[PDB]
Design a protein around this nucleic acid. Structure first.
Lengths: 68, 419, 78, 420
DNA sequence: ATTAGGTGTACTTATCTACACTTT
DNA sequence: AAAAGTGTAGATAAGTACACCTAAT
């Protein structure tokens, strides 16, 4: 639902949805993606983070992005 | 020489067997090649699945017990002919794929209801109705379940439940308690209930690769593969030590290990969701005393987007039975003895999986603490109990808490252990 | 010319190619997107940068990226 | 009351005009509404384009000169009826869209070749064969079909692939040829232009990029285009930033197309960064070349489903050559319309106004002004034989060209340090 | 009580504005 | 003689981690 062209905030909101869709708390979700919980919160809130941090979570949750 | 592959009532491809070259070939329809998913990761859609991988995958669908010998003897074929065995069991197998010989179906379809009188006579004398240590044994049957009467499903309709009987003491009670505990703990696990036949008790397990559509005659299947078919392993590799417990063979592990199990996370839809499910599966089996957890006890749904872990099934505490050899079928840091597991084994284990130790402690601590209040809950989910059975659960209860308190003691040391 | 999924490196290479596709130098692309030339070099090489920085160039060059749907399990499973 | 909208040989929609309410309505077919692109950004595919915006878009396709008065006299209609005027020119307009009354086509199609003598009589006697005080623009011209050898007028689905322009005012042809070629030599994106000779009289043949001649048979493929006016949803009257006049009472009224308003369209372009650069170079080129007549209808965009893209430049002429006209920039730089009053401050506050880094301006400005001196020499050789006055004209052209470059090049380095 | 959240030092790291250089 | 890609260096300043600190329902 709501689909998206992707921006920084919706991407963060997308991660929260995939995380919640998988029934995962932020602390366990953070550890498997190789980041701190606070950093994962920053990502979900769309707060500025390193591109590498986002890719760790992207690769981790098995979510793929492509150029339209 | 050619068996068609059917998904439900629909034909998704063809399984070819060349008798002369003793070879298997699986090629798929074109519509399925783009939009579909392969039998296993090792039998791709382009038809590049090796004959060996196909063969092992088919063999992985057959029974390992006397039922195997009952099937080959009923048809009167050799152990070495798999082709005849598949085509026979083709309509109903694990997963959503039914293997159909070309142009042959009853169907018709209908049903065969069951009476309590025929099962009780089929309970008491195993000879009439076709020793060191442990695998199984155990009795079981696959059946159609409407909520009231059990029946044999025929044709396109298939058994939606597996009813399991206890020849050995309190096997039904053991698995029911443990399976229920997982569900009560919030784990993802197939739904199980106890059912009564005469004086004898049975365990009715709901199949998640089958869904009964109410209101008419059909049974909808969802495809699944075990960790063996996924890793492309022979049926022999179900245990991490693929030969035996022997001291000369103790050092041979070609089978499924935890590192090999977790490796499948990458192919799953959600690698993170699986890896916790993987570890919870490990940690749960440690706390409940399940040493029999092996490759065919953990399975995945097959979809075009990727694999997904199934709900857990066949969860049993073997520590209850001391007439059996109990070693973890999947080791923790090269330590197979459940009683020799300490902070170090766990620390080096997670390190082996390349996962943070703080995560084990989190999951281990959370589950082990919630068990004491959760075990009491399961006891209430039990049907009427006799005195001997109440004594069993008492022993069950006691040593369950013993595993929890034992692990809960040294768990704090895992963080600081230097390997 | 072919990237099915995007990763950190291919993304950088994607930016560099569209920049070249518009016959646009690295100095002008950086300024118009509101970043330094050095950073755009870092972006194109896939070296780690701030997500906002990637987005500055992204919206600027008019390249849109989207996830994949589904409806996971393609509105299926039985 | 209803004109069908045709793209090439295909029908993409319907233009409805209600006579009573004096109103326009544009609705689209279902296949096109999903898969296509609108006439303009202000006339969306769902058919929600307001009647007023539609009217202005059509008016923006009509001539502003005596050709208008010749057209209305030929049809014998009122100035206030646009529908009849569009319906007359409906088959051939700017862009790929031809507006066709239902069930009416010539085609037939063929061609009508031309002899040089009938063109010269239309050059030599504008009164028999078609006082301005002080103005800027516009030239006489005709639209024609070009096969590479002989010229003809294309009829029906066949259309003019080139614009042939005639010189009433001194050396206009030489002016635009030099400037259009100079831009191309500098590597800018600009339409291909050639000189053609009629008798003793010379003309400028410009290649249409919204039209493509397919060799080998009879067809012409069109690609749709819109002006910056049609894109901004501005009236034809707003083509100049000051939409009324130079009058001191009106000096402070700018409702028209500005540079900041032009650059705002970059977001709508397929590649905003690539667009903004073409725009700024267009400004910087027009400043260095002395083009003060560059306005809203002289800058256009291709229309595609993915977005707009800037077209190659066209109609680049240096008006600073002609002092018989009062010249103010049709698009201001930091609220300064005078080309001679432009200094480091105006440019700085201009880029600041565009919210763009100043270092970007100096790069383009510096590079172009230095590459010009060597570039002018190149273009001069691409000319045919010239008489004495024309060589003196171009000699004058060249000298002050370098003077503008050298002039700007003086204070440009100070642009960085100016505090607004 | 378990979850989403906020810290707070301290580690490591990017963006900025030039000048300088390795390549046509 | 460029002219694009690619550097470096100091002041800025921002995100990440970590054991664990702590409110938020």
């Amino acid at each position: 639902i709501m689909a998206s062209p992707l921006n920084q905030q919706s991407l963060g909101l997308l991660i929260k949805e995939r995380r919640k869709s998988a029934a995962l708390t932020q602390d366990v979700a953070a550890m498997l993606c190789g980041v701190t919980k606070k950093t994962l919160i920053r990502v979900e809130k769309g707060e500025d983070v390193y591109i590498s941090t986002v890719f760790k979570i992207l690769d981790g949750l098995g979510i793929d992005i492509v150029s339209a | 020489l050619t068996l068609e592959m059917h998904l439900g009532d629909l034909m998704i491809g063809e399984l070819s067997f060349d008798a002369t070259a003793d070879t298997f070939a699986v090629h798929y329809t074109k519509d399925w090649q783009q939009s579909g998913f392969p039998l296993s990761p090792t039998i791709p859609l382009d038809g590049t699945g090796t004959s060996n991988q196909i063969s092992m995958f088919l063999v992985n669908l057959l029974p390992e017990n006397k039922g195997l010998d009952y099937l080959i003897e009923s048809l009167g074929v050799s152990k070495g002919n798999t082709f005849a065995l598949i085509r026979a069991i083709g309509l109903d197998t694990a997963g959503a794929i039914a293997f159909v010989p070309k142009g042959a179906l009853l169907p018709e379809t209908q049903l065969r209801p069951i009476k309590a009188e025929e099962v009780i006579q089929r309970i008491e004398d195993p000879t009439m109705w076709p020793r060191l240590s442990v695998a199984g044994v155990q009795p079981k049957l696959n059946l159609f379940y409407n909520g009231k009467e059990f029946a044999f499903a025929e044709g396109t309709l298939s058994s939606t439940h597996i009813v399991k009987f206890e020849k050995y003491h309190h096997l039904v009670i053991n698995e029911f308690i443990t399976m229920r505990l997982a569900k009560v703990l919030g784990m993802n696990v197939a739904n199980v209930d106890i059912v009564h036949f005469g004086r004898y008790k049975a365990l009715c397990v709901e199949r998640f690769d089958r869904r009964n559509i109410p209101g008419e005659q059909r049974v909808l299947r969802r495809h699944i593969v075990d960790s063996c078919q996924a890793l492309g392993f022979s049926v022999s590799k179900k245990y991490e030590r693929n030969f035996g417990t022997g001291r000369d063979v103790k050092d041979i592990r070609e089978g499924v290990s935890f590192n090999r199990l977790f490796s499948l996370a990458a192919k799953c839809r959600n690698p993170v969701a699986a890896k916790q499910d993987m570890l919870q599966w490990a940690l749960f089996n440690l706390l409940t005393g399940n040493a029999d957890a092996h490759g065919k006890n953990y399975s995945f749904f097959m979809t075009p987007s990727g694999m997904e872990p199934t709900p857990w099934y066949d969860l049993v505490s073997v520590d209850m039975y001391e007439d059996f050899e109990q070693q973890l079928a999947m080791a923790i840091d090269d330590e197979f003895d459940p009683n020799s597991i300490y902070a170090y084994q766990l620390a080096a284990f997670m390190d082996g999986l390349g996962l943070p130790r703080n995560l084990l402690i989190s999951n281990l601590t959370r589950i082990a603490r919630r068990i004491p209040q959760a075990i009491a809950e399961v006891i209430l989910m039990l049907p009427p109990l006799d005195e001997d059975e109440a004594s069993f659960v008492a022993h069950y209860k006691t040593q369950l808490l013993a595993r929890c308190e034992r692990y809960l003691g040294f768990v704090d040391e895992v963080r600081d252990v230097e390997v």
